[PDB]
Amino acid sequence: MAFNDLLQQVGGVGRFQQIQVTLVVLPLLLMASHNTLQNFTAAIPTHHCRPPADANLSKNGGLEVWLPRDRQGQPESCLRFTSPQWGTGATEPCTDGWIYDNSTFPSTIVTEWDLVCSHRALRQLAQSLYMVGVLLGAMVFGYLADRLGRRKVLILNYLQTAVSGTCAAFAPNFPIYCAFRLLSGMALAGISLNCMTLNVEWMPIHTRACVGTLIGYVYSLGQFLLAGVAYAVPHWRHLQLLVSAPFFAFFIYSWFFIESARWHSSSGRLDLTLRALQRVARINGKREEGAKLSMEVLRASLQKELQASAMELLRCPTLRHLFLCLSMLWFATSFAYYGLVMDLQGFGVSIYLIQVIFGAVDLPAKLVGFLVINSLGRRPAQMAALLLAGICILLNGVIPQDQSIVRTSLAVLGKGCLAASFNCIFLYTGELYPTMIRQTGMGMGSTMARVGSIVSPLVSMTAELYPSMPLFIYGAVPVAASAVTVLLPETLGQPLPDTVQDLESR
C-alpha cells in the first residue's frame, strides 16, 4: 500500500497528469453526442403519404384530394385515399412512399429508410442496439483492458469508434447502420471505462474524487456540444461523420499515452512500473527523485499491494440484499433518464433549445444534489431525486400536450433530478459495499444501468399501444425505486465497511 507514496514522490499531480488527463477526458465530450445522437440523426419529420404518381396534382388540387385528415385537420401520416375524393372514402396503405417535411430536418435515418408507419419501431430498435453494444463493450473491453493494458485498449477503442461511426454515416441500408452503431457503442463503452481507470490510477488518491467529478461534467458539456453541432450540420450522414471523425485524431495522439504503472505492477512486470515511473519523473521535472527509484525501492514500497467474485454478491444473503436493492436503483435511474432524454420533440419547443436546456439543468442539479446529499443524508437524497423525477414524468404524461411550458418545465426538472440520482447512486453504491466486493459492486450497478438503457427504447415502442404508456412506465419505475431506497442503510458519517460483518452490524 505505497504506490500512492511513489506517485507522489514522482511529482503527484504535475505536467504528466495535467497533459494526459486533459487528453484522455477530451473524448468524453463526444460521448453525450453519440449516446443521444439519434434525437437529431433520427428525428421524425412530418410525413404524409405520397399521392399516387399517375394522379396529377394540378388537376386534382394537390394533397387535399388524396390524403385522409385526422381530428387535428392535418394530413394523416400512414394512409392515402384509394380513389380521388372530391370535397368514408377507402384508405389504402401508401405504396408510393411518403413526402417528408424538409423545413426542420433535411434528412434523418427516418427519412432515408422510410422508418415510418409500420416500421416506426425500427428507429428505437437502433437505439437499443447501440446500447446493447454499450453493455457488450463494457464487458469485452473491461476484460481486454486487464489483459492488454488500459492504453492499448484505449487506442483500439478510438479507432473502432472512428471506423464504425464513419461507416455508419455511409451505411447503405438499415441493417448495416445498426451493425456499425452497435460496434460504435462497444468501443465507446470501453473509452468511458478506460478513461476512468487510466486517469484515476495515474492520479493521487487525494485527487481521485475530483477526477471522477471532472469526468462527469465533461460529459454534461457534451450535451451543449451536440446541440451546437447538430444545428450546424442538420443532415444525418454529415452529422454522424462529424461526431465520429474526431476519434481518428484521438487515435493518432493516443499512441503517446503512458500505460498505468499500477496495471504493470499487478501483472508482475515491475520492470515496466519502473520505466513508467521514471518517464513520468522526467516529464514532471522531478528527475533526481526518479533516478532514486530503483527495483529495491519500488518492490519494497509496492510489496504490500502485491476483489471477490460476482457470484459472492448473489451468494451471501447480506450482499444479495444490497445487490438487488442497488440494482433496482441503477436500473430505474437509467431507464427513466434515457426515456426522458430520448424524446426531445414532443414538448413543443425546438429540439435544439431543449437539448441546451436539458444540458444546462445538469449543472444546478449536481450542486443541489451535492448540497442535499451531504447536508441531509445520502438516502433521503435518493428517495427525493427518484420520487420527484417519477412524479414529474408521470405529470408530463397526464398534462395535455397543449401546455408546452408546463410540460417542458416538468421534463426539465425531472431530467435534472435523474442526473442527481446518477451522482448519488455512485457515492451511495461505493459507501454501501464492503472493500472486498466494492469494485465488483460498482460494475454490476453500472451494468444494470446499461440494461436500463437497452430496455428503455423497447418500452418507448409501446407508444403505438397508447401515446402515454411510455411515460407512465418511465415514471412508475422511478417511483418504485424510490420506495426501494428505504430498505438501504444510511451512509452519512459512517466509515466505509471492510467486511460483511460490518454490513451486518449496520
Grid coordinates belonging to 161: 469508434
Superfamily of domain 1-36+118-306: MFS general substrate transporter like domains (1.20.1250.20)
Distance between CA atoms of residues 83 and 74, nearest Å: 19
Handedness of CA 479, 483, 489, 492 (dihedral sign): positive
Query: What do you get for the CA distance between the two ends of the chain, in Å?
Result: 27
Indicate which technique resolved this structure. Answer: cryo-EM
Is 361 buried (19+), middle (13-18) or exposed (0-12) by CB count in 10 A?
buried
Span 308-506: which CATH code?
A: 1.20.1250.20
Distance between CA atoms of residues 85 and 203, nearest Å: 73
Look at strands 98-100 and 80-81 and give their pairing.
unpaired
CA angle 54, 60, 62 (to 5 degrees): 95
Look at strands 91-92 and 80-81 and give their pairing.
antiparallel
**CB of 180 closer than 8 Å to CB of 125:** no
Q: What phi and psi values does residue 394 have, to the nearest 5 degrees? A: -70, -25
- Helix, strand, or coil (residue 434): coil
Distance between CA atoms of residues 297 and 256, nearest Å: 27
Distance between CA atoms of residues 107 and 120, nearest Å: 16
Ranges of H-type helices in 99-245: 109-112, 121-148, 150-169, 174-201, 208-232, 236-244
| Residue written as grid cell 471523425 | 245
| 11-15: long-range pairs with CB below 8 Å, 24+ | 11/280, 11/281, 11/284, 11/285, 11/286, 12/204, 13/203, 13/204, 13/207, 14/280, 14/283, 14/284, 14/285, 14/286, 15/283, 15/284, 15/285
Grid coordinates belonging to 450: 446499461
Please compute Rg for the chain using Cα positions: 26
How does DSSP assign 47-113, residue by residue?
A: EEEPPPSSS-HHHHTTHHHH--B-TTSSBPSS-EESSPPP----EE--TT-EEE--SS-S--HHHHT
| Residue written as grid cell 401546455 | 403
Q: What is the 3-state secondary structure (H, E, C) of 200-226?
A: HHCCCHHHHHHHHHHHHHHHHHHHHHH
Q: How far is CA 301 from the centre of its chain?
A: 39
Common-topology check for domains 1-36+118-306 and 308-506: yes
Domain boundaries, the chain: 1-36+118-306, 308-506
Q: DSSP letter at 400?
A: -
Q: What is the per-residue burial (b if ≥16 Cβ within 10 Å, else e) of 328-352?
A: bbbbbbbbbbbbbbbbbebbeeebb
Grid coordinates belonging to 495: 466509515
Among candidate residues 63, 62, 54, the one with its CA nearest the CA of residue 96 = 54
% helix, strand, coil for the chain, step of 5: 70, 0, 25
Distance between CA atoms of residues 298 and 418, nearest Å: 44
